[PDB]
Amino acid sequence: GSSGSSGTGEKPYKCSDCGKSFTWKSRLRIHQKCHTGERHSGPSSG
Numbered sequence: 001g002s003s004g005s006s007g008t009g010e011k012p013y014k015c016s017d018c019g020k021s022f023t024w025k026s027r028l029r030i031h032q033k034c035h036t037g038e039r040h041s042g043p044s045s046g
């Protein structure tokens with residue numbers, strides 16, 4: 001179950017954990033924590 005969603009343009013933010021780019025800073029913060037915590041959540045949407 002490996003997803004791949006690439007946009008366009010070097011984002012000012014990058015997750016130094018997996019390797020994903022985020023346009024908004026707020027979003028990243030959420031993702032970061034998302035990593036840890038297994039609550040009926042495995043596969044991603046996009």
Ligand SMILES: [Zn+2]
Nearest residue numbers: 015017018019
């Ligand atoms: Zn990440």
